[model samples]
Target: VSLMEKLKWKIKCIENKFLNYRLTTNETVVAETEYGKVKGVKRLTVYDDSYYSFEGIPYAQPPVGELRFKAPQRPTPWAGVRDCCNHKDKSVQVDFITGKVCGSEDCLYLSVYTNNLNPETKRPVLVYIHGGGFIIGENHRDMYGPDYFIKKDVVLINIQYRLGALGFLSLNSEDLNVPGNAGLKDQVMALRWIKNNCANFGGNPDNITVFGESAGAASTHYMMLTEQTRGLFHRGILMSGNAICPWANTQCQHRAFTLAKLAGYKGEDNDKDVLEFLMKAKPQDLIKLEEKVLTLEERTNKVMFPFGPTVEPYQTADCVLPKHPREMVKTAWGNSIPTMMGNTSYEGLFFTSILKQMPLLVKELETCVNFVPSELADAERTAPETLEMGAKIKKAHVTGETPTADNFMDLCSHFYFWFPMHRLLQLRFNHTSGTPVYLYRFDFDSEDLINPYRIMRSGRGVKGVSHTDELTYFFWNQLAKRMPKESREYKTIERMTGIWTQFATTGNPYSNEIEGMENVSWDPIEKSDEVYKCLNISDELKMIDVPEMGKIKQWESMFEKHRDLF
Candidate 1:
């Protein structure tokens, strides 16, 4: 560990001891920002550390009425102290349970959790973007709370963005040219808000680290790639997502019109007319269109949502995703920011039950044609080249001659999640010119804190870490039962959050000896190293070169052969 890191750790230990000695006052805390003054309620973390909670702080003007499909604008300044005790309504989205439309269009809010409110303290800031496939998610503390991170002495901020068609609808006409990625614009606006006002809550604007999971991780990666979000954050932690992931980018002009049609638009097929109709439509009606917009082929390919970030056909000052993420990586500004990225062992487990219901998926796997990655799914599904790729994937992953559900799950895990991340890591290493980039694979599987994806089924054959498994350890996961502090699950929690907060605090996961994980050294993948290395995080944390390069090479060859398609 560096001397600075050691000293900081020592200071943090002292601070933590001092903090623990204080009683839980649970008092009201007030902070003044560029917009206005707001008050937060003091709460105790799961570890019993006192921290202030401020939610529902608007970062942008509501994207309603004339602002509906355009880039976000600065928030309207408030006059008096706003009561930021409750979380604001999330961006308009379909409710996961009832299939009914819930939330609001005026939901550009953020929540702050901090141990200190003194501006001069300047604690390192962690701005989080919530992940729900760019379609459904909220920044509520029910799933993601400050229980783990706030105790570590960093300011934790969670920002909500527009979801589904409301956030990602793009048009192909010159008159009503609404290029997609307005949701990303919301995120950037939130970062700018935090940058300007974080110091009021004892957050260091200069030491901001933007991080997220799944789609949120991809958003952070996108932030690194684009010029608009540069300098808004200094570091990033991308958990199981990147811009290069096939689902992260799509051209959805057709879906935009389909959604408009679903909203009862009977007007002529003109972009201007469509935009007018959508603007006048009810917010719930527009949100309900999410279910009707996707095509059969999209469902078969496991494209979860109809709308998402897309390359702008015309370059504008506010174009969030200007080009394909693969191309963007070649010249992305994110390389300068210190980055830590990786995925779970079985990212496909999240989709197993859903995939099981798709007869088309079974047929595709049975015929070996469906094994083609989603990046090339639009190509000839039965062409010899596509067939060859399928055969190679099946032979490598499938144990028996016939593909089973487990075999298909492995395919999704590789093509949809890990391979794209692997390619991004390689690209970053090849093109790096800045700070050391750390990689990790979360391998801890806890019985008490198992992934919800695994619990959807009997979990009869699930054998590896599932997608979002690491989330339970990082956040309080209030939806589920809590684990005992003395349990091994709690130890995993300590280790995982420890490493993450350490990175946010010091730009290095192994900056000091984490409480549960001691005497472990993590080395970043080097450009000259023939084999890429990563930290395998489990009950026993250890640094080792990535395993199963043979399978990764097969994917590398396939993408190389069809560079144009990707």
Candidate 2:
């Protein structure tokens, strides 16, 4: 027994020696990749002697100065060692803290974490895109650290793309030189960089999984649809986002034009000029104007600038928009990739909270409809059958007797969030073949977060895994330190991290070792009547089906009526 223990110690020491040697030697090493030679950081790991970390590796050129509004270009190689120890700064967008300066157009960069600084075998790669409504968020958010996935022997890369008008503005002219959806184009460039250079980071270029939440999810969907992103990734995970028929097409362009007009751009001919002016405008002036046109209340109330991806004529030069997501998916653009898509239980709570607090009346609903130029709204007003079907679905959430003033708000949530996401999943599942598709519904309620709101409104006490709540599980590293390590909730965190890592490694999320899975079997969604794996903090995993979610089917019919406009 003493000999075996001594041998174990010797092996550990040898491993540590190898790790330290690699770190010290490779710190200033240059990697000759397809893009160019890049200098990366090297650090020894605490657990495995064979593993090391290479942080803040540049994946593309900095989209700054004259390249501000243009699509990201290939990163230029440096002649000497480049410092990659710090997190890349994020693009300028809305400030949550001071409501002031947040980012700039110079935010096209990516960070990588790897277990093998240089290895003989290829490992699966997991690329992460962050969610902040396509207007906010960064790649350097501390919660998305590489330690969790690195331990699982996977290479993780987090990307920072352009946000706001600089990234997603729609182009109106036939000019092929202008680049729109620069943020998405940057993502494509990052993927291209990975395909050409991921081998040096000990990753398999062919085995790549792209995952994101909210706007990031939307971006993932867009990537799947765009021809420019073809062959860049093998699989995808979409959390709390889905492709809708009209949201990205007419609505997005209309909103952009409306916001531009509201911001003092008066033009009928030069849409590019309008975009250029907005891009060059002072950040403070833009913020104040955006706030004025779309107040905080109006912004959250779903009456703000609805910025999203646009369908445009595909140009080989610009590579903005190839085709509409709906058309691309229907034509089998995303058919080759395995997809895992899902949403949270209280998907509409965030938006509904704003609606509930506002003093809106039944008459205002009509006025609100008239405030926009949506043909669907006009059709719904004219069609009595449509209104009746919507009202019947809206009545399901009520407690007793007649429907209250909140009925329309509930209807809006169903129409916007729940229905669109569900339809997108159904379409993808039905259309795509040869690759397995998985779906989930996050239903766990946080008592600590929800309990505080009980004093304010009727439904304040009735929260069930809000829209951004699931994020706490994946991005709550900072919050974890505050709690006891041996606590029950901590175990849930362990389970979540395990499942995420497992999925990133093998494309399958289920694991028998997860704390709450002794008697429960979590199954993937294959049909509309299927139940999803419900994760909770008590370490009790269960399967529950929500038949009432069939309202999404009804919403699909309503949307189909306006498919032409879309």
Candidate 3:
């Protein structure tokens, strides 16, 4: 009888999978989730590998009406199989290309792709968090496909979290305490869902790894700092962003009221009224407020990102971050978790386009305003010592009387992305007990297809990999065209995905299974080394000393002198 039961279960499962595949021409592949049964589809990756794809799986209840601006709640269980074959709505955000408000408030969803369906297979799971400075981005496969990851033996998952004002608006009142980081909390809820359901999809819930780029990377760092996400994941991969980044955390309580007034809220200026008014407000109207939220000074100091994560005022069990990241990092729960983190070569090139749009920005950089670190901008924008610090910064990065595009790009790269990431490196290195911390500097410039950020922003004669450049190697996106077989770009794809999947499988970034990585070995940073080391990932992968160690030290000294101000 026991054997008969096992036979029936296996038969029913195969019937589900095959029925969903052959009957629908691979348009539907059914799988059992914790909440209910979900119908997915089979698809071919860029490399023509077939895999099972489940899109738009709701990890949480829709954050609409009363739930808006609050921490995400557990997903409602369904009675029948829910069709999850199509992409769902994203959080409300401005389209980077169209310059228009798009997406919806009901956007707390995740996608899963896998190669195995047997419950006992226990493939390693890789969860990706998309990045758009915490304002715009989604889990859509159009840009973030499972093609690269599924080609390996691991399970790939992509998540969508709330963004901008809707996701993060803190209003502390006597009657109600609305401490924010709903975006981060949404991610936590997604992790919980994955933990409870991944086993049913052939993924080992115990071997999960969360990774992302830019703001997503920062969110990944925040996940490690918070106790709320304990045991949800084991390893992390952060690219080009961290919790220590100046723009990662900010004071946004006043921005909430400012946004309400901008959205045509004529009610009394009180917390209750603001929350009630915003609850009734249209999402598009609120999204429109983003363009006008930032002041000229904020932009001048390179604090372009508004409505990001902030320290909560309310003390509650649901609080994502009761204290700031710097304080929390002292004893971060994930200090010993295996991590792989790094940034691109010309990270600042992503922001230099701001100079072109605002012709006076270059003049401002040279004269009235000093380019202080974004972390210090809040307190030191007009401080008497700002110019003193700015002068030192200018002398350090620029040589000409006026800042040129090339040197100015370097200044942006160092101040905004590199310095903060470097700071995080030092902190993590000091705190980690024994786990390996793998670091890299991505310098590959693809000859077959250039990074989209460069083509859109970096002009002729300007060279080196810019921000988001490394993403091309890991994902098949519309912006960056595909590469042919056996070509350098294809090899790069193989190399990057291979390393990443290997890291997800094990705590390290090396495995004999990866093509082209057979004889090479990547060395992790050691306590004995005074000069920090990193893997320079390019045509040839080699371990080398981290670039600009001297400059990093100088920036460290400046921060240390003014540590009290921060």
Candidate 4:
């Protein structure tokens, strides 16, 4: 073990000897920011550490009325002491889990949590972007708390962004007719605030790290490729998503009009007219009508995620994304910030529960994009090349013992999740300059984890740690309070979060270590390394080289034949 791990373990032995993490006093904690002073509440954790949290801090002027559908405007200054302990409403969105849709037009809010407030000791900052397919999510305090990161001396901040059509759907015009990636603009604005004011809460603005999962991960990756994000952060962490993932980029001008039609605005082809008309209707009502449209569309796999980043033609105002995310990564346009990125063993498991119900997914997988989803389906008619490659992907990947539902889910998981993930690593690894890419594969599942998804626990014919399963290890799970401090899950939690915070502080995941996973060197995929090796986070944490290359090679072949499939 390194000297740091030995010291950390020594400290771990005496962590709870002196202090209880419980917040006993009613005294409110106040922190001053660039805008004004805000009062926060104290929260205790399993480790017996008290952390202060400031919830619902605004980063931008609410994107309402004239500000709607345009780049986010900087937040207006506030006067009196703001009550940041209470959370503000989140951005409007469509809930896929529950058929509920509700939010506010003015929902550009952020939550900040930290262990100390000393300007002299600038702690590294972690700004999290929530993942919900860029369609629905809220930066709820109940969902995320100060317990995990603050317990380790890292400051955690979560921000809310516009979702679905409200966030995407641009005309690709410099004249504000098409404002591409307004939600991303909201994120840049949030980063701008953190860079200018995190010192108030004892955070190092120069050492900010942007991290997220799923679409949120893609959002972080997208910013890495944009000029707006230049120098805003020094490091990033992408979990379960990458900018090169096929679903990350799309051109959806038609979907903009379709959204208008759904919003009771008829035949508004003009970009300004559509935005003006859609602005009149409540976002809550608009998403309800959109949900109905998606229900019928899903029968044929027409559109899983209809809204996301888009390729835009350059114009007046600067664009948030490039014409091609993959090509941009290849050229090394903006890769100054190094990153730690990887996916859950079965990222495909996230869509399985829903795809399992839709039998058509089988045929869709067997055919071209047409069988995929309407929004994702490339052109009305499939080319002979597309059909041939699609057939190859299905015949090779979609085969198993009797083709049970288990293997089918595995196939989808491999093609959509892991295949593209490999491509991203290869692209960035071969690049000329940039920080070394730290890779990982999360495949562990333990009882202490909230048992919401059965795919991981079933121990069925085919099972890998499902998507978002690793998240419970990093963030405190409030849904059920059954997490055992003595469980394997606790070890994984300590190692992952510790490694992550270490990366934020030193631009390397190995700057320090916590007790559980000791002496494990998480190496980067350097340019000269012929075979990429990384840390495989599973039942037993270990280092692996070219893991599962047998199946990984097949997907590599698939991508070679069909470049766009990635």
Q: Highest lDDT: which candidate?
A: 1
In model 3, the Cα lDDT at residue 308 comes to 82
lDDT of 2 by residue, 235-338 (tens): 88887775562334333443455566777777763656666666666654554454444444444334434544666544656474666565667756666677
lDDT score of residue 110 within candidate 3:
96
| lDDT (Cα atoms) of all candidates against the true structure | 0.78, 0.59, 0.78, 0.69
Residues 1-566, candidate 4, lDDT per residue (tens digit)? 23554354346334432222333335468888888888887766666767777888889888887777777877777788888866788788754333467678788989988877653578999999987777777777445555667768878899998887778757744565555678877888888888888888888888989999878888888867777767888888988887777677766755666677877887648776776777787778766665544435442443456566777766436567756787777654446567888877666666555654566555555453443323233454376655655565565555653444555666656655666677777777656475667888887865445522332233223356777777677775334343567778777777788888988998888743476467677788776665667778886777788554555666565456345644
How many pairs of residues collide in model 3? Answer: 2
lDDT string for model 1 (478-561, tens) is 344556777878888788877888888788888556764566678876777667688888777887777746667777766766
**Per-residue lDDT of model 3, residues 471-532, tens digit only:** 77887554444468778788888888888888988899987776666666677877666777
Between prediction 3 and prediction 4, which has the larger TM-score?
Answer: 3
lDDT of 3: 0.78
Using TM-score as the yardstick, the better of models 2 and 3 is 3
TM-score for each predicted model, relative to the true structure: 0.91, 0.79, 0.91, 0.87
Clashes of 2: 4
Q: Number of clashes in model 1? A: 0
What shift in Å separates residue 334 of candidate 1 from its native position after superposition? 1.1
